[PDB]
Amino acid sequence: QLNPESADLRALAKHLYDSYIKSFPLTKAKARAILTGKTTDKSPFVIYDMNSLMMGEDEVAIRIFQGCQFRSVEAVQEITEYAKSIPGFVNLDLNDQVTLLKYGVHEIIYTMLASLMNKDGVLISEGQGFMTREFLKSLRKPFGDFMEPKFEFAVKFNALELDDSDLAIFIAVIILSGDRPGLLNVKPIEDIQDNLLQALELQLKLNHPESSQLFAKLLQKMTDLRQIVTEHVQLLQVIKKTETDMSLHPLLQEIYKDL
Amino acid sequence: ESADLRALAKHLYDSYIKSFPLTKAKARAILTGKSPFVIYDMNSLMMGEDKIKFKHITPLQEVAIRIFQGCQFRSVEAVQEITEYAKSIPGFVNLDLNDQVTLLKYGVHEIIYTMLASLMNKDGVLISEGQGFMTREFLKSLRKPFGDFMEPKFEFAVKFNALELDDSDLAIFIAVIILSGDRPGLLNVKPIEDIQDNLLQALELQLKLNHPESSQLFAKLLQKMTDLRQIVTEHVQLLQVIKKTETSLHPLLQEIY
Ligand SMILES: O=C(O)Cc1c[nH]c2ccc(O)cc12
Ligand SMILES: O=C(O)Cc1c[nH]c2ccc(O)cc12
């Protein structure tokens, strides 16, 4: 029914779930509680136009983009804190540690960003705001499409119906890759992930009995992430040329470099 | 064991062997221990056309261009082998005709590189039913954009072949790839996903029974699907950049491709 074996993997599930709660202020559970309206005090102020973008504080395209940019830098921070708590992660070559974060941080950001989205928009400013997909798609030329592929992924991905205890493990599997470019020590990294994969596989089986092969369906979604990430950097480089007065955060510049 | 899955597995394996001339097992014997004609440079390629007489892709009345053309001729040839295998997958044929076309259209490039891996090692790849072996370096030896056409694939193969899968495994892995419900333009996704789910259980059992030793191999293999997509898009980009050189006379040839 559950031997020494699984028992250890559950202990790992719990451990990761706990660090996740402790590292990310806005879990999917809270995100969805705000979005479904199962509240009165948790309801968000909606921004669907310039008019409301104004009241919402109580050119824009860039004021918004740069808003995402720094929020993004903040996520790299929360994720880096989460990584450290991944058994074995800190025991690796400090170089490989940086490499895993370099390539992993964004795929993780979009995985989690889905938790704040629904087909119509996304929660912002810690859930207090809600920016609609349409207002975002209406931004001037370039910026009008930087969020669209995120919604794309989010709708398909949210369909898997995963909760925080699931994501916590899935997000760890993402960091502990190994096929990541320039890793010095691949075996050590692969020994961790193999362990994380069993954790997720069991976690999903127990958490979603009625959902068969969800493990594989979740694993296949990683292709979507890479594509998303690539597309982002690409749209990112273009903007760099069009808007030369707009900066980019150093940290963020170090992640996209040689990426 | 759900004999139903152990069945779908043998079925798929049986079809894989009938649809594909050169198998992973066959190709691993050559690479290791009637040796193929080795093509390591320009002169060896020359004698190769008269020897290997792989002149099915060449008689068409520029070394880097005749090589690239040659790969495409094989690619087309493979597409038919894949299309035939596809029809062996339980239920594939019963799908909406358009969706069957859609699945094959977006899966062929992924399956080709997946199987191309079977024919290559870190130092080269097997060509023409395995009669040849074009070295990997003579391929970087190519100028223009032709010097990085295959390189991204040797890299993929090295990571992929490391999984040490065999034809019984690849047979199911490929079925899974074709049955991808995220192909743009599909009309009725449910059927395709149900079948893929079904194919996923078979590949899972296949790998646990065939590779008890390797932990989570199923999971690791699925991950390779990422590198595959990346390999394909990147490849499609090359075919774009290459579209700036030139283009029985061509008119009809350019059409077949
Ligand atoms: O990827 C980046 O560095 C910037 C970025 C663009 N759009 C986003 C939406 C949410 C988020 O957290 C960050 C971003
Ligand atoms: O629900 C998730 O997967 C986590 C998540 C996504 N976006 C966020 C922005 C801020 C924050 O504290 C947490 C999150």
Side-chain angles (χ1 to χ4, degrees), chain B residues 82-108:
Chain B
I82 317 295
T83 300
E84 197 210 317
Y85 175 66
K87 291 184 177 61
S88 323
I89 310 172
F92 181 76
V93 158
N94 288 141
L95 299 168
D96 180 73
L97 282 298
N98 294 91
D99 285 351
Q100 281 171 49
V101 174
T102 282
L103 291 179
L104 251 25
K105 193 156 295 300
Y106 291 104
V108 281

Side-chain angles (χ1 to χ4, degrees), chain B residues 216-256:
Chain B
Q216 291 285 135
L217 186 56
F218 180 57
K220 301 182 183 181
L221 170 61
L222 287 181
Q223 284 179 302
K224 298 291 165 289
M225 278 165 94
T226 293
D227 307 79
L228 266 186
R229 299 300 181 82
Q230 175 52 48
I231 289 293
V232 184
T233 72
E234 174 166 345
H235 166 72
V236 187
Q237 305 316 303
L238 204 298
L239 302 167
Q240 184 266 307
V241 181
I242 194 280
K243 285 300 300 174
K244 299 67 209 289
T245 303
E246 36 68 15
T247 25
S248 78
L249 274 165
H250 240 48
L252 225 45
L253 278 177
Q254 302 194 62
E255 194 53 60
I256 307 177

Side-chain angles (χ1 to χ4, degrees), chain A residues 6-22 82 85 87 164-166 168-169 196 199-200 202-203 206:
Chain A
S6 53
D8 273 312
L9 291 175
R10 289 303 287 164
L12 179 64
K14 285 181 171 184
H15 172 60
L16 296 165
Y17 180 47
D18 218 58
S19 312
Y20 175 94
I21 296 304
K22 297 174 176 172
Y82 177 69
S85 88
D164 293 299
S165 70
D166 294 315
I169 309 181
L196 289 171
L200 181 54
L202 184 47
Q203 173 45 40
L206 295 174

Side-chain angles (χ1 to χ4, degrees), chain B residues 45-175:
Chain B
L45 177 49
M46 227 63 84
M47 189 193 305
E49 300 199 311
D50 323 66
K51 177 53 190 174
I52 300 175
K53 189 168 286 60
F54 60 99
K55 307 166 70 176
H56 317 184
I57 80 91
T58 54
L60 299 305
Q61 48 194 177
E62 55 287 69
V63 301
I65 284 64
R66 208 185 297 83
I67 287 184
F68 176 66
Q69 293 165 168
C71 276
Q72 293 303 296
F73 176 100
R74 209 313 180 174
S75 292
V76 166
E77 194 172 70
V79 168
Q80 295 311 308
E81 315 191 322
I82 317 295
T83 300
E84 197 210 317
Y85 175 66
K87 291 184 177 61
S88 323
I89 310 172
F92 181 76
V93 158
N94 288 141
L95 299 168
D96 180 73
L97 282 298
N98 294 91
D99 285 351
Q100 281 171 49
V101 174
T102 282
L103 291 179
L104 251 25
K105 193 156 295 300
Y106 291 104
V108 281
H109 282 83
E110 279 163 36
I111 292 171
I112 281 175
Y113 298 131
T114 295
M115 296 185 86
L116 185 66
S118 294
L119 279 48
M120 46 170 76
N121 57 218
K122 80 184 184 178
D123 307 291
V125 50
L126 254 29
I127 64 80
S128 66
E129 296 140 55
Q131 294 183 308
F133 182 79
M134 195 167 263
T135 191
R136 175 183 188 175
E137 280 309 296
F138 169 60
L139 292 171
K140 314 222 294 174
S141 164
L142 302 181
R143 99 292 177 170
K144 294 186 62 177
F146 295 105
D148 309 294
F149 177 55
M150 292 304 301
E151 203 46 42
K153 308 176 185 179
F154 277 111
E155 298 177 61
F156 172 80
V158 179
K159 294 161 76 173
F160 198 76
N161 289 321
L163 298 180
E164 289 198 59
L165 299 182
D166 58 49
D167 302 295
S168 343
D169 305 320
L170 290 171
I172 316 183
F173 175 60
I174 301 170

Side-chain angles (χ1 to χ4, degrees), chain A residues 194 201 212-213 220 226, chain B residues 197 204 215-216 223 225-226:
Chain A
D194 182 337
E201 182 169 54
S212 61
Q213 294 289 147
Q220 308 195 73
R226 293 280 207 76
Chain B
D197 165 85
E204 197 180 15
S215 185
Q216 291 285 135
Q223 284 179 302
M225 278 165 94
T226 293

Side-chain angles (χ1 to χ4, degrees), chain A residues 18-56:
Chain A
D18 218 58
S19 312
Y20 175 94
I21 296 304
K22 297 174 176 172
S23 300
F24 307 110
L26 194 54
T27 62
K28 183 186 191 169
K30 182 176 182 184
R32 303 248 76 75
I34 300 181
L35 284 172
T36 56
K38 64 165 73 81
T39 52
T40 30
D41 55 302
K42 295 79 164 292
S43 65
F45 178 78
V46 178
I47 298 159
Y48 58 111
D49 73 355
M50 236 64 270
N51 186 297
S52 52
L53 177 276
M54 296 188 256
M55 290 243 273

